[PDB]
């Protein structure tokens, strides 16, 4: 018995969260004799090259940026990466000393794709100004992630990936002062470094770059406090300075003329912002605990320019901050730089198809 | 011009810790490593560490580890050695070094320090 | 630790003559050496950085070589002022010195 209307018959898709080792893929020249390339060939895929997602019409799905278990095999592919690459002359870790050759080798990071193999997929959330953690109202699926640089750093996030709106800022919770709040801008800020020992920080652009978080902040912790930025409250030179690779050679670099400044308390400059900078033979690791030693830099001329899409910060409250909060650069855990790119991402297992009721 | 005077000779008995000095001038203390070396009587030179004063980054050869400590007082631009658990065979000269010039190798030395160690 | 092995242990040579004297890591450490002369009582004096760089005011006839594991320090025009005793030195993290290596006159 049949009417009008033809009746459509729907076999809808089924998901379910779930964990899978992934692969990757890059574009890594086999004639490159950088770490980077010469890992990715070994282990990764080629690319693309034309990248397309199937838009989910009104579907809405939960995220939760601090347990993606993508940041987890991450973080272990960085490691291995280390491991056979930046070979230290001196690994101290347990108790243990170890010594061995130590080449010093090319060393820039290269974008790498996180793909789902047969059988899963990996929904990504496509709401610009999305936190992280809860309801995506437009996400979409996926073959590979995007292009991810393994930029291995602290204080500042490097050669990462711009807010496509206004400045994001993401945490696990706001709340507790000890969880870091992983900053996302909507305009990269250039950071000139050299071998000579500084780093250069255009002063106006930088000053606008913190009234945006500044402002960000503000209205997470109610529109009434003033906020002030301060250098960090101390630790490890990894922590303390702005920690970061740059051709081989750790930087340490001082990062208190960039925070130290107060906004919202309503009551001659520099061109640039220079920052006092060092190499170090002698640095703690970031893999796992312990110290490691490594050669003296090669020649003198040592560029590296890189763009500051994100910052790490912590804030420091207390039962006593009323009517002002401080933040201070923080960072350390590797994984919140993977979380700031693998943060709209997460990846589902499919099975069998479900057809759908009738109602009107 | 650049200088490091170290202290004088020292007299232990075997047990016992010395620590001695070795005040700086003539550059930019905090901004260089400084090493530490002994030669015992008429024998090869003997390296023992270094430490890096603004962190206080030390390292230590294997046959002190556990037993040596090397710092370094950055205000009065002085850096001190320490010995714990002294022997009959640690009985030698004990010479700092540094490298203000950054040639990685020991530019500067002090005139010595002798330590004799005995019943 | 790495083990800095130089030979000969002594070596006799007249005026004039022309010495190589020898080190051997037990691990690559590239380019990253050092020589010092040493008379007796007095402290070592730096002769050779990074394997091949002569250090300032030193005489000509001194120069080493090598790369990797394998060095030398070498004299040509052997001069009175040149019978000492040298010693080799990683550089590149650990200072370890090498056994030693005299040179004494020969008569």
């Known amino acids: 018995t049949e009417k009008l209307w033809v009746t459509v018959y729907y076999g809808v898709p089924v998901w379910k969260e779930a964990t899978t080792t992934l692969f990757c893929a890059s574009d890594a020249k086999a004639y490159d004799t950088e770490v980077h390339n010469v890992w990715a060939t070994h282990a990764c895929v080629p690319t693309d090259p034309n990248p397309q997602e199937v838009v989910l019409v009104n579907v809405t799905e939960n995220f939760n940026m601090w347990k993606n278990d993508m940041v987890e095999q991450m973080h272990e592919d960085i490691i291995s990466l280390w491991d056979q690459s930046l070979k230290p002359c001196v690994k101290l870790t347990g108790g243990s000393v170890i010594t061995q050759a130590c080449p010093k080798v090319s060393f820039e990071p290269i974008p790498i794709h996180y793909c789902a193999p047969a059988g899963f997929a990996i929904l990504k959330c496509n709401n610009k100004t999305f936190n992280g953690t809860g309801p995506c109202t437009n996400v979409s699926t996926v073959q590979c992630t995007h292009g991810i640089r393994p930029v291995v750093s602290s204080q500042l996030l490097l050669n990462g990936s711009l807010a496509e709106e206004e400045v994001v800022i993401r945490s696990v919770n706001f709340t507790d002062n000890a969880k870091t709040i992983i900053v996302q801008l909507n305009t990269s800020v250039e950071i000139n470094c050299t071998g000579a020992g500084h780093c250069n920080i255009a002063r106006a652009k930088w000053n606008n770059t913190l009234k945006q978080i500044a402002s960000k902040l503000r209205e997470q912790f109610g529109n009434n406090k003033t906020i002030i930025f301060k250098q960090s409250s101390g630790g490890d030179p990894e922590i303390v300075t702005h920690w970061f690779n740059c051709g081989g050679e750790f930087f340490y670099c001082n990062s208190t003329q960039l925070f130290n400044s107060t906004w919202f308390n309503s009551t001659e400059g520099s061109d640039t912002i220079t920052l006092p900078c060092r190499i170090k033979q002698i640095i703690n690791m970031w893999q796992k605990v312990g110290k490691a030693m490594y050669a003296p830099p090669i020649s003198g001329q040592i560029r590296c320019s890189s763009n500051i899409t994100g910052l790490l910060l912590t804030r420091d409250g207390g039962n006593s901050n009323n009517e002002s909060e401080i933040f201070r650069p923080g960072g350390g855990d590797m994984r919140d730089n993977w979380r700031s790119e693998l943060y709209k991402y997460k990846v589902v297992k499919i099975e069998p198809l479900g057809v759908a009721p009738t109602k009107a | 011009e650049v200088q490091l005077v170290q202290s004088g000779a020292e007299v232990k008995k075997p047990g016992a810790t010395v620590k001695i000095s070795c005040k700086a001038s003539?550059?930019?203390?905090?901004?260089?490593?400084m090493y530490w070396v002994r030669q015992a009587p008429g024998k090869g030179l003997e390296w023992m560490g270094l430490?890096?004063?603004?962190?206080?980054?030390?390292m230590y050869a294997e046959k002190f580890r556990g037993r040596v400590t090397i710092t370094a007082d950055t205000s009065t631009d002085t850096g001190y050695l320490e010995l714990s658990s002294l022997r009959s065979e640690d009985t030698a000269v004990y010479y700092c070094?540094?490298?203000?010039?950054?040639?990685?190798?020991?530019?500067?030395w002090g005139q010595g320090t002798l330590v004799s160690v005995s019943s | 630790d790495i083990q800095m092995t130089q030979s000969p242990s002594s070596v006799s040579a007249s005026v004039g003559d022309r010495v190589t004297i020898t080190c051997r890591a037990s691990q690559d450490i590239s380019t990253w050496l050092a020589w010092y002369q040493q008379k007796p009582g007095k402290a070592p004096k730096l002769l050779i950085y990074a394997a091949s760089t002569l250090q300032s005011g030193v005489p000509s006839r001194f120069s080493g070589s090598g790369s990797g594991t394998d060095f030398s320090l070498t004299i040509n025009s052997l001069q009175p002022e040149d019978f000492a005793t040298y010693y080799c030195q990683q550089a590149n993290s650990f200072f370890t010195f090498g056994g030693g290596t005299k040179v004494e006159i020969k008569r």
């Open positions: 070094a540094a490298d203000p010039w950054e040639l990685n190798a020991f530019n500067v």
């Open positions: 003539g550059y930019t203390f905090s901004d260089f490593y």
């Open positions: 430490i890096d004063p603004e962190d206080a980054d030390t």
